[PDB]
Design a protein around this ligand. Sequence first.
Ligand SMILES: CC(C)(COP(=O)(O)OP(=O)(O)OC[C@H]1O[C@@H](n2cnc3c(N)ncnc32)[C@H](O)[C@@H]1OP(=O)(O)O)[C@@H](O)C(=O)NCCC(=O)NCCS
Ligand SMILES: O=C([O-])CC(=O)C(=O)O
Ligand SMILES: O=C([O-])CC(=O)C(=O)O
Ligand SMILES: O=C([O-])CC(=O)C(=O)O
Lengths: 435, 435
Amino acid sequence: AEPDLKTALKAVIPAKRELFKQVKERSDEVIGEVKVANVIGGMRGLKSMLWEGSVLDPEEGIRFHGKTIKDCQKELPKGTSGTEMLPEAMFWLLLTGQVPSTNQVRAFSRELAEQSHLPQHILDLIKSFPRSMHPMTQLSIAVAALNTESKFAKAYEKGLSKADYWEPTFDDSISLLAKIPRVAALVFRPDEVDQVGTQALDASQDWSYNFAELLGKGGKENQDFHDLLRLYLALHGDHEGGNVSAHATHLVGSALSDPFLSYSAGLLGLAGPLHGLAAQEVLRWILAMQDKIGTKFTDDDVRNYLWDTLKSGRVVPGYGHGVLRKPDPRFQALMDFAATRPDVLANPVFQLVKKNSEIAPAVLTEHGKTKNPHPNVDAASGVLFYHYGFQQPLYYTVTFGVSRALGPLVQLIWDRALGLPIERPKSINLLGLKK
Amino acid sequence: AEPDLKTALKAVIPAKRELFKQVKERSDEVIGEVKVANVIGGMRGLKSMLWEGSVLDPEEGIRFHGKTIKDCQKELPKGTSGTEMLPEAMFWLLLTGQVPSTNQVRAFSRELAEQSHLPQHILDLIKSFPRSMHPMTQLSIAVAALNTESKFAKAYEKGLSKADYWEPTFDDSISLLAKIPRVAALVFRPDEVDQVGTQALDASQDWSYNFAELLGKGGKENQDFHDLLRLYLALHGDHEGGNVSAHATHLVGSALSDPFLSYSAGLLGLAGPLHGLAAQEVLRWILAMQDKIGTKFTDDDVRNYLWDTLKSGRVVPGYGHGVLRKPDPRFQALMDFAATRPDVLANPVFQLVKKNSEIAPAVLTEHGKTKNPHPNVDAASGVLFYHYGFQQPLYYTVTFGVSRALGPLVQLIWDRALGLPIERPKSINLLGLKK
Ligand SMILES: CC(C)(COP(=O)(O)OP(=O)(O)OC[C@H]1O[C@@H](n2cnc3c(N)ncnc32)[C@H](O)[C@@H]1OP(=O)(O)O)[C@@H](O)C(=O)NCCC(=O)NCCS
Ligand SMILES: O=C([O-])CC(=O)C(=O)O
Ligand SMILES: O=C([O-])CC(=O)C(=O)O
Ligand SMILES: O=C([O-])CC(=O)C(=O)O
């Protein structure tokens, strides 16, 4: 056997700690300014937090340990079938800063299958949800409810040494990762909780495949979607630290809440319309537009629907970003996935998304409120699930929730390993800013 | 009939918006520096966020709209019985910036009783929790599950103008405030869910009274505790924006998650040992000390127990603070509550807390590690509940959760009224700080 993930982590921990010691010697160095805009504009442009596994360039998009999406697509191991990079390999990369071998990822995928089972009480809890409860509300709750399984909480409560916080944090992160797909599947399939909640995973298969199996999309006849799902989950894993869900996870984590509670809070932030609930909102908005404009439509019909949306005092979902000033390479990667599949390009809903990406930026620029008129990844993700038969847009952000566990759980482990403190900015009132 | 809370808010909204417009003209003005310490040290000392209702004074401790705790104790309306300021009146003050009349508060207390009822599903959900599930995990979950009752989420989902965000946000905040005590009581009393979950509240009684009734502590014989609970909840409502629970609520709120989801995340942050658990930790530490030193003890017995605690590499809980450099006026207010109650002063556990506050600061200073050797509010809060028969310290953070809804829900309403954007800072890795 090659080194397992935990062993791989331990090898890189001392080097990171030494680097932390060196960065700390320069604590007093000025790296920027705070202005009034930063305070009133939700900390926009303010480099104020540490995130190790990914950094976002506004012009060029995301890099994971200095590697582009395309670099990751080429370098990360693939599944037993298919052409797309595995999220579990992305997780490995994020955590260790090193690309895993295919063997190492297979061993890791196998561990994730083994640890996906849920305690009976989580099944009972999910069964208590009324049918109408929003799916992200369900997902967030069930993840927090898994804090009964937390080794970190129990170890912290028993007395535990600061240097060894990361191990329980890591154990919990792997546990949450293994379980969350199944939880997510229970949200998708409320009538089939007893079967879905206990059904065995194929032990020889990757995370995305098993997530699809639990969704009712397993086997060879669904292998194209397995590839989409793999790509999708790996693309949404991490997008630096400033995004609401990552940040919330870190923030709640910094008070030494365990990873289930911490990432529950992530999920609550991800449920925000301005954040990941945009994936849902994009496709609902696109379907509404389709109903209004019909099968045969002009550019103006699309232009008018966007302008009407803006004039209603609503956002155009799937366009804009707190950091990016160009089209999101995650968005482009999903469009390129579509580009080689003629049945997807023929899907009228996808065509509408494509057409909308050609018109929305001009309209958004004419409106002139947004810093970034370009599409983000949420513009394209939902239409792709729709194409493969996931046609209830209320569930779309749930799949994002599974993905977005990856980066933030990585960061929590590092936060505990480094001994990073509680997150505690200073606030001030408007009268205080005026003085 | 005098203006209701919503009407009182509406009168002050345009003035706040005008001030916001003026502060915005000076967006480009530099108010501070970012250093490396800020990035690695959890944004400590970094003025980066807006919080309107409370500001922390280094000499004087927290002030609510410029008013001290003692100012609030004198000016805020009291209940039909008792001498302590009502939390609902604190909420009013936080929100409106003005002290309510007793009439106005009675009308508001009546609305809170009327809206405390829960959907049947919340009862079923709470019933599903295993006995061992941590109480803060229970509280956080149930609050998030109340997002089925969210007007903001349903209005947002139906299409809603940005200008109209605050009213649904306000409606939800009042709804959450009315309901949370009952939820909190269900966590305290897992065997009494059917009774506590449905019991009608006296609409002519204040929030804290009804919370006590649901706790099993109603009626004249418990009126002292009603006063404690009132004081306690009003003191813990708000403590700037930088604290984890407030911040988390704001952060998740900024992506336009409703107040149930947003404050659920607050509660998850409050569940963190470094945030919400201190009250519990103090009393366990005090009871440990009491078991060793006994009912009759000398200063030295206490001195030795503190020195032993510090030499074991542990904190003396309830002393220190991220901001405060003086004894906390919240702490002093709780000690002064005890001062007029001879049975409390006679309680050996309270005497030990008092005695410890006379000795701990010197010892902490001699040890020399801490910046702030003075007691914070957590030093005193737990012993007082213990005196009135709440002797499971595990549930003390739950009562904090009820209190800490106040300030952050206020801030959310203001965030939506002002049109504040998503909170989305820039992050950076250690390698980026090194270069
Ligand atoms: C992503 C987003 C939340 C970023 O927020 P931000 O960084 O604060 O946005 P900006 O700095 O560009 O905001 C400046 C103004 O343009 C507006 N704006 C930005 N993007 C917009 C969009 N897609 N549609 C309408 N208005 C937008 C903002 O609301 C703000 O106006 P306001 O003062 O009237 O609120 C925002 O651009 C957006 O897209 N909102 C919709 C959510 C979405 O589609 N995707 C989220 C997943 S990345
Ligand atoms: O149409 C919806 O809103 C989703 C729905 O009925 C369900 O499956 O519960
Ligand atoms: O980066 C952001 O601000 C939000 C986002 O799209 C992501 O998390 O990928
Ligand atoms: O706990 C804290 O962050 C505050 C403190 O006592 C210190 O810095 O010495």
